[PDB]
Amino acid sequence: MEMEKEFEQIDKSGSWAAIYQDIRHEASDFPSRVAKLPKNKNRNRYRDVSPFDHSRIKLHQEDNDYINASLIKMEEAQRSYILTQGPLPNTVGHFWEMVWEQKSRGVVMLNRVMEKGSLKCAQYWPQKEEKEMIFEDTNLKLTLISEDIKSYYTVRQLELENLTTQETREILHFHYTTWPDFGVPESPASFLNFLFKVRESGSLSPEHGPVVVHCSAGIGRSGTFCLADTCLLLMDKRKDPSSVDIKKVLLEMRKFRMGLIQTADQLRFSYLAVIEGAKFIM
Ligand SMILES: CCNC(=O)Nc1cc(C)on1
Numbered sequence: 001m002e003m004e005k006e007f008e009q010i011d012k013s014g015s016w017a018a019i020y021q022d023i024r025h026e027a028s029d030f031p032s033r034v035a036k037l038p039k040n041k042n043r044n045r046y047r048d049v050s051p052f053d054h055s056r057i058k059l060h061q062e063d064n065d066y067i068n069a070s071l072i073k074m075e076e077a078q079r080s081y082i083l084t085q086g087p088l089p090n091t092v093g094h095f096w097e098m099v100w101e102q103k104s105r106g107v108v109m110l111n112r113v114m115e116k117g118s119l120k121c122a123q124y125w126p127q128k129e130e131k132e133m134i135f136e137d138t139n140l141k142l143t144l145i146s147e148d149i150k151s152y153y154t155v156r157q158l159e160l161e162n163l164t165t166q167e168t169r170e171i172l173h174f175h176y177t178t179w180p181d182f183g184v185p186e187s188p189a190s191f192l193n194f195l196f197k198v199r200e201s202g203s204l205s206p207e208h209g210p211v212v213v214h215c216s217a218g219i220g221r222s223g224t225f226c227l228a229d230t231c232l233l234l235m236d237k238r239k240d241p242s243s244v245d246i247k248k249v250l251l252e253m254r255k256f257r258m259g260l261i262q263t264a265d266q267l268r269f270s271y272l273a274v275i276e277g278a279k280f281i282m
Helices: 003-013 014-026 037-042 092-099 189-199 220-236 246-253 264-280
Strands: 056-058 066-074 079-084 106-109 133-135 140-151 153-162 168-176 211-214
Touching: 003 014, 003 246, 003 264, 014 246, 014 264, 037 066, 066 092, 066 246, 079 220, 092 133, 092 140, 092 153, 153 189, 168 189, 189 220, 189 264, 211 220, 220 246, 220 264, 246 264
Parallel strands: 079 211, 106 168, 106 211
Antiparallel strands: 056 066, 066 079, 133 140, 140 153, 153 168
8 A cells, every 4th residue: 555545544543553563473583593692691781682693783893793783785776774772881882983983974773862761871972072082992082073962863973093094084973862761752853953954964874884873772763764765765766666565674774683663653754754745746
């Protein structure tokens, strides 16, 4: 079926939970043996969210190459994304090592450091220009260059220096700051505006490594971001845009990381975002 009328049909019939459970039943199951090794317990935020072995990002290190991060490679859309958990106190150096080694231009953050009164990720970037951060375990230096605070999101320019080689690179930090503590946004307008700002920066384009996107676990809000982006790109590429099937795209993405889209409300919000977005593109 088309999307917008499939949407109203699920609303009128109140069957979002059944649609979402079907997706959960059909989703791929691949091994995640490296994630579960005892030496990696303090590298995982949640025991039930792990990268598959076949798609995990490897650190370029011989001691321990493990990070909780997955490469999502969308062949028809010609887009790739790295989805990862919010960094932990003992993985902030690994996080920036990955950014460096994978040649990423942008980092997309969809959570606040504290939500619901608890810490959802480490404070992994510097908040003042004159107070830079040094990651001694991976030999990197990170400096805040500029910060632009808007009503729904903040954009930061950062400099990452590899202290071994003295090479430097400019990284863009796109921080969506207004996702509510509970539920999903009432309108997709600010989330779509944010997606378009990431696109306009070059951070999603083939001349760079894959964008790094995270929330707390790296599957819920993060899944919503890449699902909406890929569906809108396919609608521009194909002769028949109404052939784009959001459930099929989601199942393809779940071949590369488990659990993408965590609730039936997140599924409905993803439909809404693609529907509204497709009208603005034209
Ligand atoms: C339908 C032909 N035009 C476009 O698709 N325009 C755009 C704008 C953005 C953004 O994506 N497509």
